[PDB]
Amino acid sequence: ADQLTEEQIAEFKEAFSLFDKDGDGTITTKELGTVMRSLGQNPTEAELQDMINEVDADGNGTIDFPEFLTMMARKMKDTDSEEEIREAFRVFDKDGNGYISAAELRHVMTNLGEKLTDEEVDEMIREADIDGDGQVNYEEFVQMMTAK
């Protein structure tokens, strides 16, 4: 229902640099599972190549930036995309306090192999908290996808 613009396009190319630590425009099989080990799952060689061949345009175990935008905009057109957001909420809000707590958000950042301060966490709240409750809800979370 909602379409992305050149502005939203800059966040994607910018979002691609997290999975593309090489700077060539590829998300290799080993880079995707590195994301899998920080999520709390065991990555297998059968799964790694299986996930890639879904978007992989070349077919060598790497995902490119043109078709990466192809996967998100596809299932985002069924409007039943509410079941997919429940997935982002469980990764952020682990104990389901109904919203996203600062204590759990930190662990997600620290589990990625990085060290951040609480001062930055306040920035996420002003960015997603409408009434400024200090935590992130799913309802606001839904609207956060169409935010520029």
Place this chain on the structure above:
Amino acid sequence: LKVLVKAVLFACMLMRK
């Protein structure tokens, strides 16, 4: 949250496949 929100949606669609 705006950038790190798009990264989680991609891993959830490739993991449930």
